[PDB]
Amino acid sequence: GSHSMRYFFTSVSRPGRGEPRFIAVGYVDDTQFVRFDSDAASQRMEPRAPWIEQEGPEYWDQETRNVKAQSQTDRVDLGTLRGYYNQSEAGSHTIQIMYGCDVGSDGRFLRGYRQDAYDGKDYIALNEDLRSWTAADMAAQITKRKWEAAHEAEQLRAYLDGTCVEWLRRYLENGKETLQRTDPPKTHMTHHPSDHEATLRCWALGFYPAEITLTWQRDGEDQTQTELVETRPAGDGTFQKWAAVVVPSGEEQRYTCHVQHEGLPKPLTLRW
Amino acid sequence: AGVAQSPRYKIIEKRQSVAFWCNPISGHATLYWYQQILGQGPKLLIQFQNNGVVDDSQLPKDRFSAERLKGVDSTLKIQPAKLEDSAVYLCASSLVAETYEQYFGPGTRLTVTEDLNKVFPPEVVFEPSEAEISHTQKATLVCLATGFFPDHVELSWWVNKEVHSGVCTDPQPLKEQPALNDSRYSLSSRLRVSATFWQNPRNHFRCQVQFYLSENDEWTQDRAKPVTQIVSAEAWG
Amino acid sequence: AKTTQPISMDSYEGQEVNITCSHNNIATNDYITWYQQFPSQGPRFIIQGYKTKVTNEVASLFIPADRKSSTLSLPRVSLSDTAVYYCLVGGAYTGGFKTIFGAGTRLFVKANIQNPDPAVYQLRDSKSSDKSVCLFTDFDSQTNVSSDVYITDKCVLDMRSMDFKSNSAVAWSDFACANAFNNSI
């Protein structure tokens, strides 16, 4: 189906102990492929997927230059936003940025994003039309007015619907063996006992992409009254999730677990 | 405060060394070194991002070297200079990178001569013609700076206080021997004032030329070494 | 170098000056940037744009829809606007990282000589009284000033206190300032 490319940036100020910590990661769908860490010795953009390693040295020089430029921009912005919020030098503060694009199965542009945060809360976001901004507070109004009148916002729009889509197409073709795959979940149920009461855990393991839906149902009725854990990485590119429900004993076949995943032909139903 | 550069003028001989220094705007992450030979636009020599070199494509690395070790100030070195190195070397910085505004420093003027004996101080004030006061009720003064080499001078007019109104200095001097390399130059400038001002006797007019070697490369011969000096001349009227 | 612009342009003071730059191979991530370089100075940033027309207190920059060209517009030029104007195309990508100024456009601003009095005079040295030079002066800007005959180019001085501007040229006996399209006395 559709595909996405995302870049994530975190800049954390370090009052009195040097420059801020800066970490950048790039994702294609749910697969990370690049990273930069200002505390690492290389001081280069580094590959994190096999298919990106085949890019030549000009790619890595360009990516290293632009990631350091992003880092310097956020370092300047940390000092600027500190003044906007009338904060002191003593405290630590964080700027987070996410941006990217989505493409359809045809590879055509679907949407673009650019969202900025300060200390874990929305600061400014690009609207869906890629030519207007939503500012979350009064300090962000200053940035919004600056960026509304900035010719650089025209190039950002051209990157998100243009350049971003083109690079994503190139990555998808180069990583066709892995990025285009879809691993169905391996499902099973476990039983764990007071008396006349137990827990049924419905497992889903080794699936890609991360999107999945697990639901418990009693007598065909949705049972959202259940414990759902957050989808977690297995460490090998696949993901895990489980849903558990408390069951009075003897009622084991009243309960059904339903697994929805794009790697499944039809949604699975599980009975203990 | 903008970009600082050092030195401003430099005269050396073929197959010897020179080191240019630059201090960018505080906090700027990108530093550029440009070479601008006469009649052409600036050409990028080396570009730094933080303390690391980021662009070396057009650097003649047999002679050209540059370092910005701590990511603030950079030194550009020429060893050993060739006759074609005569140019103005500019340093620039940007807050982030090349898409930002590049703030340029004053630049360093470098002349590389074949022999240090060929550099000379300027020779210096033709009083207004009497027909000009009669015809126009004004008084033009003409000043000539002759025989200097290299072309490192800063002409000025002083009236009792430097003045810029009514002053026209030549944009680029002419070659005294156009077909001879390393020839001496000549520069002309004009200052015209109203007739009444030059009728007055209590006005002192000075045409001041500031010349740009130093004692380190001392030669010790008869005619005084053309040390960076001020050759001046004047008229009262 | 993606840019081609005229080698030089002449204009009279008070006129609008439009400098067109051709860049038909412009890329998506390219910006269009103009620099202005005064004599004995480094280049100075004046304007940058992407698609939409940009205006500031120094100039305006017009870019057509296809971005294959751009026009720097100086509103009302003065004599001090004589400089080199560079059109630059580049961006934060491998094919655009390097800054390339190019030859640029040498803009020359000419004064509007209200009362031309084209006349050659002979000034004499304050000390070496037997030394004289040609002084072609008070010609209008239309004329062009063309051995041991030393001829400097035409120079324009501004007497700000009297609203008087005068062109002049100096040559070093004097019949006139050699062989140019000269006139009158």
């Binding site: 870049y7 790039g26 790619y59 360009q62 990516e63 230059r65 632009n66 990631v67 430029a69 992003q70 921009t73 300047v76 912005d77 600027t80 936003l81 941006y99 900025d116 400014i124 200053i142 940035t143 600056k146 960026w147 900035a150 650089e152 916002a153 190039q155 950002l156 990157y159 998100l160 350049t163 971003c164 690079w167 | 807050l95 982030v96 990178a97 898409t99 | 991530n29 910006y31 961006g91 934060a92 990508y93």
Partner: peptide, 9 residues
């Protein structure tokens, strides 16, 4: 590839 040629807040 990364976005480039941005501006400050």
């Amino acid at each position: 590839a990364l976005h480039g040629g941005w501006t400050t807040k």
